Each structure stands twice: as C-alpha cells, then as structure tokens.
Amino acid sequence: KVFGRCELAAAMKRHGLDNYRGYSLGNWVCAAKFESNFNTQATNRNTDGSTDYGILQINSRWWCNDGRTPGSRNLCNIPCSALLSSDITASVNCAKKIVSDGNGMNAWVAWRNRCKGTDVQAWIRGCRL
Incomplete structure (x- = not known):
C-alpha cells in the first residue's frame, strides 16, 4: 500500500504517535516520506545482508525476526514480515x-537527513485532523 500523506497522518494519530515521547505527528509523517515514500512494502537490501522493512524502514539486525536467527535480538517481538503489512500497527508499535x-x-537516517531541523508541521498542513 502507498499511503497518502494525510491518510498516514490520520493512521499514525489513531495509533497514538502524535507527540509520543514529544515527537510531533509531522516528524513521523516526514520520516515515513523519506524512509519509504509512504510505501508499506518498501525494502532496502543492505550491502551487510540485513534488510530495512516497511513504511519506517526498520532494520532486521535488532528489531524483528527475519527467520535467520530465532531466539536472538528481535526486540519488537515480531517477524520482519509484520513490518510489510498494509496496516501500520506492527511498524508503529516497533517505532515506539x-x-x-x-x-x-535519529535512529532514522532519512529523518536526520531530510526532516530534522525543518518545520515538520508542513507535513500535516491541509490534513485538518
């Protein structure tokens, strides 16, 4: 699924990300724009053999189980496949x-490079949630 910008803002708001730990909704939407271009199926086959999965490009080394080393790491307690769903539940819970x-x-490189330091309120302009 490719989300629209305000469609994703609404979903992230429903999942309690707005101002979660002090990060504004526009920060989360901007991160998703530059990590995945709002594509829930995004993947990045890293040179080191690990993979970033889904709308927030969460990395398999630490956060999910890719099937290669069960009982190791997997700090979000999910299969990496859950990060590729059209529904954002698993990605939100793991991003938290x-x-x-x-x-x-700063755990999201595309956020650091394209969102940090900017007026991220622009990402929810026109959403009038």
Whole structure:
C-alpha cells in the first residue's frame, strides 16, 4: 500500500504517535516520506545482508525476526514480515520502542537527513485532523 500523506497522518494519530515521547505527528509523517515514500512494502537490501522493512524502514539486525536467527535480538517481538503489512500497527508499535532506545528519531537516517531541523508541521498542513 502507498499511503497518502494525510491518510498516514490520520493512521499514525489513531495509533497514538502524535507527540509520543514529544515527537510531533509531522516528524513521523516526514520520516515515513523519506524512509519509504509512504510505501508499506518498501525494502532496502543492505550491502551487510540485513534488510530495512516497511513504511519506517526498520532494520532486521535488532528489531524483528527475519527467520535467520530465532531466539536472538528481535526486540519488537515480531517477524520482519509484520513490518510489510498494509496496516501500520506492527511498524508503529516497533517505532515506539526504537524512538525510546536512546537516540530519539535519529535512529532514522532519512529523518536526520531530510526532516530534522525543518518545520515538520508542513507535513500535516491541509490534513485538518
């Protein structure tokens, strides 16, 4: 599924991300724009052999089980396949863990490079949620 910008804002708001740990909804929408272009099926086959999955490009080394090493890591307690669903539940719940892990939203490289330091309120302009 490719979300519209305000469609994703509404979904993320329903899942309690607006101002979660102090990060504004526009931060989360901007992150999804530059991580995945709002595509729930996004994948990035890294050179190191790990994969970033889904609308927030969550990495398989730490956060999900890709089938290669069960009983190891998997800090979000989900198969990486859950990050590829058209419904954002698993990605939101796992993003809440990541953003609490001590680097805030600097855990998302595309957020750091394209959103950080900007007026991210623009990402919810016109959504009038």
